């Protein structure tokens, strides 16, 4: 999420998460994970870059869908994207 003038700072990453991140929202596959690369998990605003931490062929071959397309306007303990988090 680059410096954009239209969307919010916490708005663009929240938009491109499950819906705009449709490959990370409805991609199909339980052999990957969306890990926060620089998400500060102590201030409640921890969206910097959700890296798709997957295997070799899972994140390299099974992640070439068009969900990453249309992102040129902005692109460039164990807790993950599951039903355990407070936002």
């Amino acid at each position: 999420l680059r410096p954009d003038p239209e969307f919010p700072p916490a708005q663009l990453m929240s938009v491109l998460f499950g819906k705009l991140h449709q490959a990370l929202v409805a991609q199909g596959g339980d052999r990957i994970g969306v890990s926060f690369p620089d998400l500060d998990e102590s201030r409640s605003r921890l969206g910097e870059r959700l890296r798709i931490h997957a295997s070799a062929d899972d994140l390299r071959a099974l992640l070439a869908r068009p969900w990453l397309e249309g992102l040129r306007d902005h692109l460039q303990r164990q807790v993950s994207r599951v039903q355990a988090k407070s936002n």
Partner: protein
């Protein structure tokens, strides 16, 4: 000698209120008739806007009127200031035209930036621009928005043919009226986002719409001339150029890169800044407003 007390500037590049519609893709040649989108309730309730289930492509339509006569103040208080201001704007115009500013306007016309939160999520966005001299069309254009970069400043043949038309309008040669339409394949039943009103949506003839000044804001994201950091790239031209979505305030008056200080030493002590700042001060005089003490 000294400055002016109260100045106003009537705006130019006047947009309209964009109405919205729906329909199916590859039926967009017949886009003078489409069932318009109505606002609905959260059945505390609030109001949303959603496409019909059979339809998938949003169509946003508005008209853009270009007036021209930039440097003429609509209200002044001293002829010794006014002749200096019109002299300086005339010397700006005869050196180079509005053509760079025109292609920067036509880029924001080219990519569908006025679809604010409806641009993302789409995958085939095509605008169509008709310049009209009478009630019939006079010059057509049909772009593709996503092939053009949202930060990339290209130089096409059709976009330059549009830019010379807009520059001729800004100089005050003819009459410009662009009936801009924009088709966005968004999918079936996706949440179209119109403008927001005090908490409700914005319909005019029982059909949802964007505010006019929002499209007028989106049409003037041209400022790549930061002092700070060009990683943001373009921004909406403002005096004390500010972003409410990001809370910053670029071109601080402690720097000598704001608008008012630029105009001050540009018309009084006749200190010409760079061409990349003459572009900024003229582009701010285009949007008009209330200047002076």
């Amino acid at each position: 000698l000294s400055t002016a007390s109260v100045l106003a500037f009537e705006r130019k590049l006047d947009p309209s209120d964009a109405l919205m519609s729906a329909g199916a893709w590859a039926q967009r040649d017949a886009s003078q008739e489409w069932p318009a989108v109505t606002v609905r309730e959260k059945s505390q309730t609030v109001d949303v806007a959603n496409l019909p289930s059979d339809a998938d492509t949003l169509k946003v339509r508005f008209t853009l009127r270009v007036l021209g006569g930039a440097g003429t103040p609509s209200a002044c208080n001293d002829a010794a200031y006014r002749d200096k201001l019109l002299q300086t704007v005339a010397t700006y115009v005869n050196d180079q035209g509005f053509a760079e500013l025109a292609r920067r306007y036509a880029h924001n016309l080219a990519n569908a930036r006025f679809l604010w939160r409806n641009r993302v999520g789409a995958e085939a966005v095509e605008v169509r621009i008709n310049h009209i001299r009478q009630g019939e069309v006079a010059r057509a254009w049909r772009f593709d928005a996503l092939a053009i970069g949202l930060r990339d400043f290209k130089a096409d043949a059709e976009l330059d043919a549009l830019a010379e038309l807009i520059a001729s309008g800004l100089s005050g040669s003819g009459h410009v009226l662009l009936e801009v339409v924009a088709f966005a394949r968004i999918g079936d039943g996706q949440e179209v986002f119109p403008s927001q009103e005090l908490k409700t949506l914005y319909s005019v003839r029982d059909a949802a719409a964007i505010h006019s000044q929002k499209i007028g804001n989106a049409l003037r994201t041209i400022d790549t001339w930061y002092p700070d950091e060009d990683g943001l790239g373009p921004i909406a031209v403002e005096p004390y150029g500010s972003v409410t979505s990001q809370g910053k305030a670029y071109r601080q008056p402690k720097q000598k890169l704001d608008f008012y200080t630029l105009l001050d030493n540009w018309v009084l002590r006749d200190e010409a800044p760079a061409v990349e700042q003459q572009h900024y001060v003229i582009a701010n005089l285009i949007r008009g407003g209330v200047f002076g003490e």
